[PDB]
From a paper:
We co-crystallized [name]Δ31 with 14a and determined its structure (2.6 Å resolution). The structure revealed that the hydroxypyridyl-glycine core of 14a binds, as observed for 4, in the 2OG binding site. 14a coordinates to the metal (Zn substituting for Fe) via its pyridinyl nitrogen and the carbonyl oxygen, its glycyl carboxylate forms a salt bridge with the side chain of Arg316 and hydrogen bonds with the side chains of Ser318 and Tyr295. The plane formed by the pyridinyl ring of 14a is skewed with respect to the plane formed by its pyridinyl nitrogen and carbonyl oxygen and the active site metal. This orientation is unusual, especially when compared to the more typical co-planar orientation seen in the [name]Δ31-4 structure. As predicted, the amine linker of 14a apparently enables its p-nitrophenyl group to have a different orientation in [name] compared to the orientation of the naphthalene of 13c. With 14a, the nitrogen of the amine linker is positioned to potentially form a hydrogen bond with the Arg322 side chain (2.9 Å); the Arg322 side chain is also positioned to form a cation−π interaction with the pyridine ring of 14a. The p-nitrophenyl group of 14a is positioned between the Glu234 and Tyr108 side chains of [name]. Notably, the Glu234 side chain is displaced ∼5 Å by the p-nitrophenyl moiety toward the surface of the protein, an unprecedented observation in available [name] inhibitor structures.7,20,21,23−26,41 Glu234 is important as it has also been shown to interact with m6A in a structure of an [name] variant in complex with a ssDNA substrate. In the case of [name], our structure with 14a, provides evidence that the side chain of Glu234, which is likely important in catalysis, is susceptible to conformational changes.
The fat mass and obesity associated protein ([name]) is an Fe(II) and 2-oxoglutarate (2OG)-dependent oxygenase that catalyzes the oxidation of N-methyl groups in nucleic acids, and, in particular, of N6-methyladenosine (m6A) in RNA.1−3 [name] is a potential medicinal chemistry target due to its roles in obesity and cancer. Here, we report the use of structural knowledge of how [name] binds 2OG and substrate to design potent and, at least partially selective, [name] inhibitors. Using information from crystal structures of [name] in complex with 2OG and substrate mimics, we designed and synthesized two series of [name] inhibitors, which were characterized by turnover and binding assays, and by X-ray crystallography with [name] and the related bacterial enzyme AlkB. A potent inhibitor employing binding interactions spanning the [name] 2OG and substrate binding sites was identified.
Numbering used by the authors: 27 to 164, 189 to 213, 215 to 250, 262 to 503
The structure:
């Protein structure tokens, strides 16, 4: 059968060198006590203020509430999509980007994890330099970029509060997180983790461990790495892609800060605002009224506009409001941006209404009319399916049982009897009519 290796095994060390060499462990001895206290106190400060939340993710089309409470901290305006859920950063005091902040204690913790982020980056760079030197024996711009952590994901779980899955392949026992890869990260980027634990043939069940295995491979024995207070481990160059990792629950609670280079080419506030302004170039912008007039009705421009319409609504507005008043407990940073994004979105609703108005114009030849329909039919259809999915998710039995502050909100939403909106929430009657437009031709 399957098996795993711990420092109690003679083969454990040689197995580490020959099969998991890009995995680096740094014990609490290598971390200053002054930094140790600051980070651990920051963990409990965020826990005391209730800044850690369990997420209502969707996996394989099934609504699941994660056993691990978590929070995202990182650069202002940055996001990390994980398990189809876009987490928004609680900002930390990056250089020349001073924040109005959150509550005073919460701001200290974010600065603290920024300080921890700086230290882990330095260790990662040295580790990557040593890794490259060893390979050379047997560019430097890449090493800095692959260690340039932009966000950290904090997690907390109390095993005593959760009724746990057994590890299925190597008998590693109870799991807090199943085998997986850390996704949505820059290619070959390193991951640094700070483990904060609290207080026989096989691994110790009471001690927290991180598991490791090769992808597609349960014949190679896995590694169970015990984690104590202040232990740090690093997933170097391509370990995260070639190997899977899991978390093995101990007996006591445990915090962890996992620092990542999030891939955010389409996941920043600056990126999405620029996308919104690209869509609104097709609108006469003298005044912000309800008489939306479009500069061009070219199918290519219309298709790009309605795609951006979906991106801001579903990847940003509905993602943000599905988590409810979660960040308001932590920071007010995203309040104005989400108001601005919602304002930009409402104008695009007028654009769509303008596009539908032009389609039904009397002096528009069927040649040009069908062209517009072919350009926007896919975009409007997805907007219909996704609105149904998000509306259903906000009313699922699991969702209705959440705490009031974390209750999902299907925002934006408006009843059919609402005249403040140019278009209704349900588009099926429009979609069916538009589909029949191409059928009659
Ligand atoms: O706590 C520790 O010691 C180690 N932390 C982890 O293992 C850990 N990784 C995660 N990564 C991840 C998973 C799925 C996806 N996705 O897009 O699907 C993206 C990223 C998520 C939660 C986690 O607890
Ligand atoms: Zn992970």
């Amino acid at each position: 059968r399957g098996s795993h290796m711990t420092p109690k095994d003679d083969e454990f060390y040689q197995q580490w060198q020959l099969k998991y060499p890009k995995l680096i462990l740094r014990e609490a001895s290598s971390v200053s006590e002054e930094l140790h206290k600051e980070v651990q106190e920051a963990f409990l400060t965020l826990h005391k203020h209730g800044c850690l939340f369990r997420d209502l993710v969707r996996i394989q089309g099934k609504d699941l509430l994660t056993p691990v409470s978590r929070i995202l901290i990182g650069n202002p305006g940055c996001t990390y999509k994980y398990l189809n859920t876009r987490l928004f950063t609680v900002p930390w005091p990056v250089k020349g980007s001073n924040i109005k902040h959150t509550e005073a204690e919460i701001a200290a913790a974010c600065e603290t994890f920024l300080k921890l982020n700086d230290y882990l980056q330095i260790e990662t760079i040295q580790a990557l330099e040593e890794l490259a030197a060893k390979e050379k024996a047997n560019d430097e711009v890449d090493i800095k970029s692959r260690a340039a952590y932009n966000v950290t994901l904090l997690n907390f779980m109390d095993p005593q509060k959760m009724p746990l899955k057994e590890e299925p392949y190597f008998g590693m026992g109870k799991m807090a997180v199943s085998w997986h890869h850390d996704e949505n990260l820059v290619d070959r980027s390193a991951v640094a983790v700070y483990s904060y634990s609290c207080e026989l043939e096989g691994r110790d069940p009471d001690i927290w461990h991180v598991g490791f295995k090769i992808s597609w491979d349960i014949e190679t024995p896995g590694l169970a790495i015990p984690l104590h207070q202040g232990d740090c481990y690093f997933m170097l160059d391509d370990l995260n892609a070639t190997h899977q990792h899991c978390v093995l629950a101990g007996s006591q609670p445990r915090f962890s800060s996992t620092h990542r280079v999030a891939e955010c080419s389409t996941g920043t506030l600056d990126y999405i605002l620029q996308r919104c302004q690209l869509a609104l170039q097709n609108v006469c912008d003298d005044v912000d009224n309800d008489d939306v007039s479009l500069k061009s009705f070219e199918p290519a421009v219309l298709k790009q506009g309605e795609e951006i319409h979906n991106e801001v609504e579903f990847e940003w507005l509905r993602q943000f409001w599905f988590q409810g008043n979660r960040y308001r407990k932590c920071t007010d940073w995203w309040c104005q941006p989400m108001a601005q994004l919602e304002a930009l979105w409402k104008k695009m609703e007028g654009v769509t209404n303008a596009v539908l108005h032009e389609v039904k114009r009397e002096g528009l030849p069927v040649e040009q009319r069908n062209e517009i329909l072919t350009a926007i039919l896919a975009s409007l259809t997805a907007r219909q399916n996704l609105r149904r999915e998000w509306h259903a998710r906000c009313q699922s039995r699991i969702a209705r049982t959440l705490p009031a502050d974390q209750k999902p909100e299907c925002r934006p939403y408006w009843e059919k009897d609402d005249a403040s909106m140019p278009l209704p929430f349900d588009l099926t009657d429009i979609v069916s009519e538009l589909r029949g437009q191409l059928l009659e031709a």
